[PDB]
Amino acid sequence: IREILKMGDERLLRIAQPVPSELLGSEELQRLIDDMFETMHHVGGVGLAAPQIGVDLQLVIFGFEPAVPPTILLNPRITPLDDEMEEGWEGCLSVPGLRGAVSRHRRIRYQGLDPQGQPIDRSVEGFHARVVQHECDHLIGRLYPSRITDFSKFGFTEVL
Numbered sequence: 540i541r542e543i544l545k546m547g548d549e550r551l552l553r554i555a556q557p558v559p560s561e562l563l564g565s566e567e568l569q570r571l572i573d574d575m576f577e578t579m580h581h582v583g584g585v586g587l588a589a590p591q592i593g594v595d596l597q598l599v600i601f602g603f604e605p606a607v608p609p610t611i612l613l614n615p616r617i618t619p620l621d622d623e624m625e626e627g628w629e630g631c632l633s634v635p636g637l638r639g640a641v642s643r644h645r646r647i648r649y650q651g652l653d654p655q656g657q658p659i660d661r662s663v664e665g666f667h668a669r670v671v672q673h674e675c676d677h678l679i680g681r682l683y684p685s686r687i688t689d690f691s692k693f694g695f696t697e698v699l
């Protein structure tokens with residue numbers, strides 16, 4: 540169980556380093572992944588990026604039992620499948636107490652590596668697509684407030 544960094548912390552602004560291929564399949568990468576699951580799960584989040592716990596790596600996890608498969612994604616690359624955008628409510632453990640509506644691509648392809656270096660290549664839409672965009676934003680130093688285009692839909696969760 541690891542401390543989730545909060546918006547304002549300069550570490551969330553980094554462009555994360557790729558996971559080195561030497562670390563694929565290692566116990567250390569395993570431990571990091573397990574800590575991330577334990578951390579995400581303890582605070583009840585749908586996703587977590589390694590930078591939010593202060594680890595400078597292109598690694599994210601996400602899962603929701605609109606269900607989304609439990610996934611561990613390294614060194615990702617996202618490709619929008621079209622121009623259709625869709626607004627949805629988002630929150631984030633690094634921005635506690637808030638929700639905001641954010642416009643994302645409705646459908647994406649994502650690629651990357653699983654923790655053993657096996658290739659991942661999925662096309663997905665709706666919520667799954669949103670989660671993946673949201674978590675990969677952490678790897679380029681972006682939190683969702685920086686993606687809001689309608690500020691009337693940004694506020695405290697209990698107020699909204």
Ligand code: NI
Nearest residue numbers: 558559560561
């Ligand atoms: Ni290398």
Ligand code: NI
Nearest residue numbers: 580581582583
């Ligand atoms: Ni539990």
Ligand code: NI
Nearest residue numbers: 630631632633
């Ligand atoms: Ni987040």
